Amino acid sequence: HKSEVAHRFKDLGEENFKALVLIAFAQYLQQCPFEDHVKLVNEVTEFAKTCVADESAENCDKSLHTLFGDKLCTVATLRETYGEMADCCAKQEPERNECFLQHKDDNPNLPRLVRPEVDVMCTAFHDNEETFLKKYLYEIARRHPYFYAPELLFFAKRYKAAFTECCQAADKAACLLPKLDELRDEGKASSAKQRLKCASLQKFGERAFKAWAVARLSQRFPKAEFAEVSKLVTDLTKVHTECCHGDLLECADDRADLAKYICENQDSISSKLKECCEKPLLEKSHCIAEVENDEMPADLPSLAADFVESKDVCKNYAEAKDVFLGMFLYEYARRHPDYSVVLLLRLAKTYETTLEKCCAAADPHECYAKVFDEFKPLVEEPQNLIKQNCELFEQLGEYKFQNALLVRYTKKVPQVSTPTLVEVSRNLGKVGSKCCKHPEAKRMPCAEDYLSVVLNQLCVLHEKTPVSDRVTKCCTESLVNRRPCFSALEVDETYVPKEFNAETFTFHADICTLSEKERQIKKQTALVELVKHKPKATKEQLKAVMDDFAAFVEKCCKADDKETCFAEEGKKLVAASQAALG
């Protein structure tokens, strides 16, 4: 293209252009104020219009990287506020952008973004809508500089819909606060999801990612031929390889290239991609990534023919092992959309281990004739774990299901900090509530996606403040073995109970005048410390202590004098539980 800036403006549209340029500036210049960035965005946008007007205008033939880096290098405070990052301007084009990207600070030390009160938010939404959402877009971008810029925009667009709807509702807080929470969880999950994919790419290599890709693409596109899924695995692998490097423009191009190829070959890939492929270039690749699984062919035979009983199984394996294993993973995944990707990866790993051992034996065909039986216990293990917990979720609420996990996982790794234990257990129970509402066919893929988010957060929190070697092993093993490693955690018998601290089990009147969440988290914090103090306590004893606690908190703010009931009745509750335990 003659003018790269002109085309992107022509296709993104002015609004998408300014917002993406705002995000881009924020992720590079994370310390500059909002007003400074708006000025750069407007200047870049005004210049972009000259290129749309005449692509031959001055500097309109420069590349986006060149033009973007020039504007960064015009910042007056570059050396004062970012220091070493101002040395990037002494370099040009390839080396300059790579220098700037290297100086992206993934975790800057900016203050916590406080969510204002609803009435303040709705008033700022109406008095200045553009400035309201745009500043927040700037605040999030600068705090997540590797967050893919379109997805960051895509979430921001949904925030406007939440405010428009709820700011005119009867109970605005009842409408808005849940939606802001879903989006905030949706975004933090997505952020952790791509950074996790990149770490796994560089920690376990391209081969392991290509295995994961065959499984995920074959489930999604089960009518697609193996040669087709294979080609899409290689392209998607280069896309993620480049996007993990971190340059927005090359990532956007690689994603748009693949999203274009898939859309021009829908007849050979999937039926579900028409609506996605009619969306603008900005949304194409994101839409395709969220497309639902296509229906698999009706009468597909079992895999026993080509992979177990047929002669040449070892011959076809040894001529090109990753081709053969890829064919096995493709055939298995496309028939089992109800399996998690890591489950199918466990299956291919077992199939690979069997062929390697058996093809070296005297009678290989006899050695691997029973290989399909080795898959069953691997398949049943998550399926049974889903039913135990979803049945447990049906019996209890989401809250009381969280309380069960609270007790369960405190006994397994009691060394984990109480805030991490409360947060991760609350999140795990929420994985239950969401995924246990899906029929059997959709339960395990649900759990894998949302367990990967919760467990990674657990492993992120644990990496920075190590406290348990077993959790470290689960966090450093293959992602395929992550969840089964955590599910293999047994109760820590070497733990010595934590010493009783009366102030930890002392409650004041603040508990009854608290938000439903802080009230739950404070009750759940006291539950963790209760288990940490009497770990060998049975469920009848604990249920008895939680039952007396329910009446204790129910009555002390059901009385005329609330403040001192909590200390006097708390002295009654704690001493009785002390005797009822140990």
Question: Residue ranges for the binding site?
Answer: 1, 4, 11, 65, 238, 242, 245, 247, 250, 253, 257
Residue 444 sits in the site that holds ligand MYR (CB under 6 A):
yes
Q: Which of residues 320-339 bind ligand MYR (CB under 6 A)?
A: 322-323, 325-326, 329
SS (H, E, C) 449-509: HHHHHHHHHHHHHHHHCCCCHHHHHHHHCCHHHHHHHHHCCCCCCCCCCCCCCHHHHCCCH
Reported as half-sphere exposure (CB side, CA atoms, 13 A), residue 419 has a value of 5
Residue 78 sits in the site that holds ligand MYR (CB under 6 A):
no
Binding residues for Zn(2+): 65, 245, 247
> Which of 471, 478, 399 is CA-nearest to residue 432?
399
DSSP 392-434: HHHHS-HHHHHHHHHHHHHHH-TTS-HHHHHHHHHHHHHHHHH
Judged by CB under 6 A, how many residues of this single chain contact ligand MYR?
A: 95
| Other C-beta atoms lying within 10 Å of the C-beta of residue 171 | 10
Residue 200 sits in the site that holds ligand MYR (CB under 6 A):
no
Stretch that binds ligand MYR, among 31-39, 94-102, 310-318, 424-432 (CB under 6 A): 424-432
**Out of 73, 177, 249, 467, which residue is the one contacting ligand MYR (CB under 6 A)?**
249
Residue 303 C-beta: closest distance to ligand MYR, Å: 15
Residue 407 sits in the site that holds ligand MYR (CB under 6 A):
no
Contacting residues for 278 by C-beta, under 8 A, at least 6 apart: none
- Closest CB to ligand MYR among residues 299, 303: 303
- Closest CB to ligand MYR among residues 107, 560: 107
Residue 556 sits in the site that holds ligand MYR (CB under 6 A):
no
- Closest CB to ligand MYR among residues 159, 368: 159
Q: Which of residues 453-492 bind ligand MYR (CB under 6 A)?
A: 458, 471, 483, 486-487
Residue 362 C-beta: closest distance to ligand MYR, Å: 25
Query: Which residue is listed with tokens 């023919």?
Result: 305
Stretch that binds ligand MYR, among 49-57, 78-86, 213-221, 304-312 (CB under 6 A): 213-221
Q: Three-class SS of residue 57?
A: coil
H helices present in 103-171, as ranges? 118-127, 129-143, 149-166
Q: Which of residues 97-116 bind ligand MYR (CB under 6 A)?
A: 115
- Breaks in the chain (C to N > 2.5 A) come right after none
Query: Which residue is listed with tokens 């802080």?
Result: 518
DSSP strands (E only) in 61-127:
none
**Out of 256, 467, 511, 512, which residue is the one contacting ligand MYR (CB under 6 A)?**
256
Stretch that binds ligand MYR, among 34-42, 103-111, 286-294, 303-311 (CB under 6 A): 286-294
Residue 60 sits in the site that holds ligand MYR (CB under 6 A):
no
> Which of 141, 153, 109, 119 is CA-nearest to residue 15?
153
First to last CA, the chain: 76
Position with the least CB separation from ligand MYR = 326
Residue 416 sits in the site that holds ligand MYR (CB under 6 A):
yes
Residue 48 C-beta: closest distance to ligand MYR, Å: 9
Residue 322 C-beta: closest distance to ligand MYR, Å: 4
Stretch that binds ligand MYR, among 32-40, 50-58, 71-79, 407-415 (CB under 6 A): 407-415
